[PDB]
Amino acid sequence: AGILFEDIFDVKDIDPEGKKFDRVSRLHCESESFKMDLILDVNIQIYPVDLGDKFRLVIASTLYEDGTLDDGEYNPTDDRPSRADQFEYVMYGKVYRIEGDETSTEAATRLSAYVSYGGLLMRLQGDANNLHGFEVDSRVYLLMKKLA
Template sequence: MAGVLFEDIFDVKDMDPEGKKFDRGDKFRLVVASTLREDGYPDDGEWNPNDSSSSRADSFEYVMYGRIYKIEGDDGTGDATRLAAYVSFGGLLMRLQGDPNNLHGFEIDKPVYLLMKKLAF
């Protein structure tokens, strides 16, 4: 999909009694995208409730807008074997760590959308 920087399906294995209410075995889909437009073209970063055009957000239950503020690699010499991208969603922080090939579209100061939905299976 155009504009998608990261996508995965997660299984809930442990639960935080103080946090979001998930049941053990629940699955959810998480997508980090650079735009909400299905065609991958950049959007203007503003939401208009009167806009009738379809959006990537229409297929998700939860959407947040944030900005990448830091990217760091391994402290070892040579090419990094792991990268970590840090995103701030208005103070709610996310660290996404993984293989550099999976995080190649992440750039500092780039706006991103985090989209989530619970899967029924």
């Protein structure tokens, strides 16, 4: 598998502070049946998004549908493995911080994983039980698909 996370989100805001960038907007999504807030920057010129949209988000450690990793080297002439091409929007990043709700003695109950997709950041808060697949410095894919 290699699918670290999978959920359906709804868009609540596009730019609460304002339009900071011409071609990039920051979605403020909330989950469904998981109660996990999301803050994602999406290229809107290539992949337009507006309010109220529902998309299915998948965060996977590999794209190859069998388990093997990719080594991070780009190669377009590799259609043989039949990668996960059922999604519309795909990004590739590196998780750089896992904040938590720890203390001196008690362990954490809520985490917050940050991933940087070459500039376009993402924060994914929620419960600490379904967020266990994330380790810092690990390459991560993001896959989106709008539900009609």
